[PDB]
Each structure stands twice: as structure tokens, then as C-alpha cells.
């Protein structure tokens, strides 16, 4: 967390032409692997490894179509294990499997399950993992959740399998499909490799196009650290270690390194994103704050000097990037994106200066009325706009407005950051509920999590509609939820050593 050590990475990297040539080659190898035969389940599981490996990005097209082929059922109706597996794997890559595969497993009677399938530990993680891909008034899926989780827990002290004991734990901290994934990679990384059934190829090739990755975020940080430098934010009082912490985040919206230019855009802004909530929570008086906001809506800065220097420093550095994450847009993609990156931040001021009024006149919002301004305020809506901006192809008033509207994909996304960032951390998500409901601190809380769990549905369900959307959009939406629950579960700089700055050993 050193600047002079994070302006230095990207000097020099560890990875060789050696190692980029056979990487290459095992890339060629695992393609093979990804089409050729194979059991069937077999090959869920090693597509499934794929994804947790990380390198979905690799073989997506491989992938699809191997689930397509894949889409003789003798392989999976017999057993649920292969039955779930098949299941998540279907949905999660767009094919519809309906909730009703897993009926034959319940008592029809009770439509519980059966509890002769607690025994197998495999059986269990597959129909648990498989239940976060449902979407609402799926009752069998909801109903799997419980008694899946509910048994995993029970079983977990039984396992004699370390490495499955490891997984287990893992799964019921947070769910696969909550999981950031190049966190994740690394992580599993280590997991796989004591498999039995594990496969070498895909393990090493694994192992090298991390740290290939790697090299890049390493190079990355190093310009974003002298960026932040130069912009003198660093010696600010507030936010400290704004920087790293949202390059981090990044890393969980995207991964990719043909994204990298993206990521660093999106990094900046995020980096002042905090520097500047800092501004309007603590350090800011409501002159000064509502004066903030004004010149950002007017894009307007000749009154800038009349705030102090600790606040105007912020708001030219936001100033200036947004036009430059503007400019960007119209070089590289030949669309001017000012007016949408000023219009973003001046919204995100206002939903800041809406709690910052709250907290200076008293007033008490209902659940509802906070979110509305607090799924705003989280910043999401910004880095979504601005991803959009950056990515979508032939960007128009258009589509960048409809976008802006915060439609339902969008907003559910949004929603979810920042009950999940309220849930692990003035007036949040659960006082706000206390309060409309006085309800206890335990029970609201519990409310809350219903929400998160509400909220992805939706998103799951947004998936499988017609959409104005396309990748990476699809992703990045996903992805910065994931995001969300890895952060809010100096675990961080174990996290941060790990996966940016420590090479896999080979
Ligand atoms: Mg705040
Ligand atoms: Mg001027």
C-alpha cells in the first residue's frame, strides 16, 4: 500500500516468451479438451473448472457450444448431482432448464426434499450452488436453498476430505454465483490442483495465464499510482488508500486484459467516488457542498475558488477526468461522452448532498426513500453509465439515455451494491428499516438479506429477457455485485498481495 512501490509495478514483469509461448499451446490443448468427448458429467465438472478457474473469457465460444451439444439424458436424470450440475450450468451459459428437474427428488407429499440425499456431500454443493440461479415464485429452488444449506451445514464437520471440507466452508460463506471472479481464480486455483480428478493441462494453463493477467494489472497499477500522485489526492486527508481499494474493486467488475483501458477509467472515477463521499460526509460544510454540486451541474467552474483547497482539488480532479473519460469516448469511439459523465456525477452529487441535508436538518427517510437516493449515492449508477460509454457498440444519445434511466437490469444491480455494502458495514440500510418498522436490529437485518436474495432473482430473470444489452454490459452488471460481497463479507491486502502482486510459483 506504498505509492513509490505501486508507481514502480509495471517495470517489470516476471512472465517470459517462454511462458506466453506454451501457454498458447496449452490453450490449443484445453480448447481440444473443451470439444472433444467426454463423459458428460465429466465434462460439466471440467467446464465448470474452466469457469472457476477464471478463464471463461478464453474459451466462451468453446464453452457454449460444448453446453449446447451437451443440451440422451441417462447421463443425469438418475442422479441429482449431475442433475443440478446440469442445471446451473444450462442457465447460467442461457439455456432454460425449468425448476421442475428437480422434482422427482422431493417427497411429493411435502414437497420437501428427500432426506435420504443429505449422505453425499457432492449432491448437496451441486443442488446448493444450482439454487442461486432461480428466479422469483420458483418454489423448488427457494425450497432447495434451505434444505441444501441447512444440510451442508450439518454435514460439513462430518467431511474426512480436507480439500472438500475447504469447498464446503467456501460455498457457505457465499454462493459460486456471488463470488468475485479473479478472486475466485485464485483461490480455486490452489483448490483444484488437489482434486483427484483434476486435470493437469487445464491446472497449468491455469496457473499461466493468471500470472499473464497479472503482468497486466501490475502495469496498470503502476500508471493509475502515478496518476493519483499527480493528482495530489493522495495527500489529502481523507480516503485513504482510495486508490487501491478501487482498483480492487475494478479487478471484480473486470478482469479481462483487453479491457484494460476500461478498467483504469473506471478505477479513476471510483477512486473519487470515495475521495469525494469522504468530501461531502465529513470534511464539507453545506455551502460549500451545495456549491460543489452546482458547478458540477452547470459544468461550470469559475466560481471553483471560493472553496477551499482540500475541496476544490477534488472537484477539478473530477472534473478533468470526466472530461477526459469523455474525451476518450469520442477518440477511440467516436461519440462524445462529456455530457453523459457530467451527467452522471451530477447526480451522484445530488443523491450526496440529499443525505448530507438529511444529516444536517435530522430528518429520518423511510427504507425506500433512502434507497431511492442511496442506490445512487453507492456510485454504481456512475461506473454502469460510464462502462456503457466506453464499451457499447456505436454509442448513441439514445442508448446512453436509456441507461441513464436506471431501467430494471440497471437498477436492481444498483440496489443490490448498496444494500450489500450497508449490510457489511449516519443512516443505512437496516436503521432506516428499524425505524419504518422499529423492528429489531437482528430482524431487520434479516429483512435486508431477503432483499439481496429478492434482488438477484431479478437479475437472474433479467438474463433470460429481451434486452437492448449486450456483453460486456451483461457482465459488468453482474460482475459489480460480486464485487460488492467479496468486500464486504486487511483481508483485503491479503487479497490484494495474492492475486496483483505475488506471481503463481511454477
Ligand atoms: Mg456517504
Ligand atoms: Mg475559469
Given at each position: 500500500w506504498d505509492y513509490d512501490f505501486l508507481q514502480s509495478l509495471g517495470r517489470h514483469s516476471s512472465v517470459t516468451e517462454e511462458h506466453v509461448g506454451l501457454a498458447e499451446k496449452l490453450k490449443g490443448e484445453v480448447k481440444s479438451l473443451i470439444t472433444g468427448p467426454m463423459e458428460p458429467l465429466a465434462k460439466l465438472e471440467f467446464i465448470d473448472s474452466v469457469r472457476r478457474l477464471g478463464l471463461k473469457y478464453q474459451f466462451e465460444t468453446e464453452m457454449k457450444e460444448a453446453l449446447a451439444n451437451i443440451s440422451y439424458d441417462s447421463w443425469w436424470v438418475d442422479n441429482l448431482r449431475a442433475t443440478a450440475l446440469r442445471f446451473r450450468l444450462l442457465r447460467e451459459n442461457g439455456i432454460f432448464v425449468p425448476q421442475?428437474?428437480?422434482?422427482?427428488?422431493?417427497?411429493?407429499?411435502?414437497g420437501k426434499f428427500k432426506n435420504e440425499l443429505c449422505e453425499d456431500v457432492k449432491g448437496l454443493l451441486n443442488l446448493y450452488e444450482a439454487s442461486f440461479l432461480g428466479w422469483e415464485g420458483e418454489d423448488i429452488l427457494d425450497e432447495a436453498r434451505t434444505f441444501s444449506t441447512a444440510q451442508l451445514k450439518n454435514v460439513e464437520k462430518k467431511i474426512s476430505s480436507p480439500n472438500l471440507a475447504k469447498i464446503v466452508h467456501h460455498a457457505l460463506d457465499l454462493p459460486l454465483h456471488w463470488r468475485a471472479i479473479r478472486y475466485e481464480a485464485r483461490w480455486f486455483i490452489d483448490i483444484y490442483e488437489d482434486?483427484?480428478?483434476?486435470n493437469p493441462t487445464l491446472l497449468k494453463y491455469a496457473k499461466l495465464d493468471f500470472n499473464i493477467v497479472q503482468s497486466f494489472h501490475q502495469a496498470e497499477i503502476g500508471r493509475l499510482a502515478r496518476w493519483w500522485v499527480g493528482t495530489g489526492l493522495d495527500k489529502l486527508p481523507f480516503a485513504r488508500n482510495g486508490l487501491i481499494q478501487s482498483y480492487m474493486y475494478a479487478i471484480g467488475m473486470l478482469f479481462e486484459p483487453h479491457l484494460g483501458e476500461v478498467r483504469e477509467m473506471e478505477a479513476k472515477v471510483g477512486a473519487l467516488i470515495t475521495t469525494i463521499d469522504d468530501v461531502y460526509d465529513v470534511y464539507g460544510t453545506m455551502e460549500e457542498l451545495e456549491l460543489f454540486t452546482d458547478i458540477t451541474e452547470r459544468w461550470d467552474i469559475n466560481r471553483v475558488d471560493q472553496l477551499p483547497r482540500n475541496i476544490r482539488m477534488p472537484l477539478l480532479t473530477m472534473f478533468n477526468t470526466s472530461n477526459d473519460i469523455g474525451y476518450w469516448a469520442l477518440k477511440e469511439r467516436g461519440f462524445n461522452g462529456i455530457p453523459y459523465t457530467a451527467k452522471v456525477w451530477a447526480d451522484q452529487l445530488k443523491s450526496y448532498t440529499k443525505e448530507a441535508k438529511w444529516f444536517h436538518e435530522g430528518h429520518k427517510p423511510t427504507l425506500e426513500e433512502y434507497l431511492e437516493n442511496a442506490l445512487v449515492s453507492i456510485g454504481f449508477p456512475n461506473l454502469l453509465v460510464t462502462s456503457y460509454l466506453l464499451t457499447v457498440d456505436n454509442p448513441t444519445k439514445e442508448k446512453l439515455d436509456y441507461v441513464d434511466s436506471l431501467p430494471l437490469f440497471v437498477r436492481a444491480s444498483c440496489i443490490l451494491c448498496r444494500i450489500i455494502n450497508d449490510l457489511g458495514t449516519n443512516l443505512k440500510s437496516i436503521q432506516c428499516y428499524m425505524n419504518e418498522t422499529g423492528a429489531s436490529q437482528e430482524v431487520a437485518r434479516e429483512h435486508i438479506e431477503g432483499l439481496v436474495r429478492m434482488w438477484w432473482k431479478r437479475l437472474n430473470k433479467c438474463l433470460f429477457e429481451p434486452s437492448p444489452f449486450t456483453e460486456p454490459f451483461l457482465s459488468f452488471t453482474i460482475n459489480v455485485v460480486r464485487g460488492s460481497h467479496f468486500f464486504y463479507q486487511s483481508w483485503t491486502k491479503n487479497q490484494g498481495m495474492s492475486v496483483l502482486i505475488h506471481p503463481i510459483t511454477l
Open positions: 421442475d428437474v428437480f422434482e422427482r427428488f422431493q417427497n411429493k407429499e411435502t482434486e483427484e480428478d483434476m
